Every structure is written in structure tokens, then in C-alpha cells.
Ligand binder design. Structure first.
Ligand SMILES: [Co+2]
Ligand SMILES: [Co+2]
Length: 277
């Protein structure tokens, strides 16, 4: 009753660094179908994202020359990214160990799953793939403030691992980099990669009365559970990317220790002290 999963199937015949888990992007492995799936996904997202995605995201797609019609060549994209913020993307097989992921970010390397979902999975894939990782995550790396936030997040991995607090950082990442909203004078916009690559979450997170929208608060977020297989019950809202970066500056160690003893908020809870939008 067990068959190899998509990550295993896609990486047949390929290898990865046993410590940093990178490989050269295997350009030869992309089929015509892959390029067509990419183009379909790209087109679908670009139709639905105007007035929903933050303006910086859509600008980043353009400035980085993210291919509309084929899976991007990572090396070519890196020429633009490096000149902008000194970041680059690196190819990985799929999910990688946490300390490796943090080490990458700490060194301004963004790990991107190299392979793409199959066409029958157009609507949704549970695993990260190159569409979610590249299209969703990479365009904001052109923004120097957002890029510094990621670098600072990466550097915080060492302290968090030493204190048994990686899950608390994982929650911060989830509720910002993956599922964050940013308020603007024009209305609420989206910066989270998991929403930006989604067929439908883009609609729900802005239009539905169902989810909570709560002002960003570092300690609250680090004490908040999430689930991976459903639309978010709570979205955290920032005023600016500067708020994220500034949140990483003070000593996180006493926050971890105070939370180690604590009971976390459920994914759909509102805390007594929340600023509820
Ligand atoms: Co392996
Ligand atoms: Co992601």
C-alpha cells in the first residue's frame, strides 16, 4: 500500500549534498509538459493577483524577468537577484533539514525545489514545488528590507536550535513569509508565498469574513499553531516590511524560554490582546 512519493519520483537518478542539500538545477529534466504547466500556472496567478498581491511582488516578477512561458533558468535569474540585493537561489530536491534551510537564508541563499507539479495537480500540491518556491517566494527578494528580514530570520536559527525553539521560528516564517498580509492605504494586500501561488486562497484571505486578520505581534505569532492542509484560520497583518525586520533585532532568547513553558494558541484562536482587523 506504499508507493514512492512525488519528491522521490522526481529525484530518481539525481543526487544532493549530504550537508547543504543543493544540486545544480537539472534543466534537461524539464519536459514540454512542465513548461506548459508552468506557463498555465504563471498566467493563472497573474490574472488573479492584480489588486490582491502587494505591488512589490508583481514588480519583482518583472524586474527579475521571471519567465512566463517556461520553468526559469536559476542561473539567469540569479544575475538579476545578485545585482539587486546580493541574494541568489539554489536548487534543492524538495523539503530539506531545518538547520540547512536556516544556514542558506543566513548566507543569502534561497532554497527552491527544482521540480514542478504534474498537470493533474495544477490546482494544488501539498509539497513545495518550483512554482510555489520560485514564483511565490522569490520576487520579494528584490526588496532590500524583505531580503534583510529573511537573512536575519536565517541567522536566528542557531539560537533557536540551541534552545529547542525551531518550531517557534517555523511559526513566524509560516505566518509571515508563507501566509502574511500587508495593510496598505489601498486596502489589504498579500505578501505570503503560500497565498501568492494558490489558486483560491488569494480570494478567501481578502474577501471572506471567515478568517481572522490580526495585527502582527512577534511573541503572539511564535506561540501560535498552524495547520498545513487547509486555508489559514488566522492571517497576521504587517504595516511594512520594516516591521518584520525590526522584529528580529532584539534578543529572542527570553521569548523562547517564556514560550517553552506556555500553551500555544490554536490556529483559529483570538488572543485577549490581539489587534483584530
Ligand atoms: Co537523500
Ligand atoms: Co513556501
Amino acid at each position: 500500500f506504499v508507493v514512492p512519493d512525488i519528491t522521490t519520483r522526481k529525484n530518481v537518478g539525481l543526487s544532493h549534498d549530504a550537508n547543504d542539500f543543493t544540486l545544480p538545477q537539472p534543466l534537461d529534466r524539464y519536459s514540454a509538459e512542465d513548461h506548459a504547466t508552468w506557463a498555465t500556472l504563471y498566467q493563472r496567478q497573474c490574472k488573479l493577483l492584480p489588486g490582491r498581491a502587494c505591488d512589490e511582488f508583481l514588480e519583482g516578477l518583472e524586474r527579475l524577468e521571471v519567465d512566463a512561458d517556461r520553468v526559469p533558468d536559476f542561473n539567469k535569474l540569479n544575475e538579476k537577484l545578485m545585482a539587486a540585493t546580493g541574494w541568489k537561489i539554489v536548487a534543492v530536491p524538495g523539503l530539506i533539514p531545518d538547520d540547512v534551510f536556516f544556514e542558506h537564508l543566513a548566507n543569502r541563499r534561497f532554497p527552491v525545489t527544482w521540480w514542478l507539479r504534474e498537470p493533474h495537480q495544477l490546482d494544488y500540491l501539498q509539497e513545495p514545488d518550483v512554482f510555489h518556491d520560485l514564483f511565490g517566494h522569490v520576487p520579494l527578494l528584490i526588496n532590500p528590507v524583505f531580503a534583510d528580514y529573511l537573512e536575519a530570520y536565517g541567522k536566528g536559527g542557531v539560537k533557536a536550535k540551541a534552545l529547542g525553539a525551531l518550531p517557534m521560528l517555523a511559526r513566524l516564517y509560516w505566518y509571515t513569509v508563507e501566509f502574511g498580509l500587508i495593510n496598505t492605504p489601498a486596502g489589504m494586500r498579500i505578501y505570503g508565498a503560500g497565498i501568492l501561488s494558490s489558486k483560491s486562497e488569494s480570494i478567501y484571505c481578502l474577501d471572506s469574513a471567515s478568517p481572522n486578520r490580526v495585527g502582527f505581534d512577534l511573541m503572539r505569532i511564535m506561540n501560535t499553531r498552524y495547520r498545513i492542509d487547509t486555508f489559514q484560520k488566522t492571517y497576521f497583518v504587517i504595516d511594512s516590511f520594516k516591521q518584520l525586520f525590526d522584529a528580529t533585532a532584539p534578543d529572542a532568547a527570553p521569548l523562547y524560554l517564556q514560550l517553552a513553558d506556555a500553551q500555544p494558541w490554536g490556529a483559529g484562536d483570538i488572543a485577549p490582546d490581539d489587534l483584530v482587523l
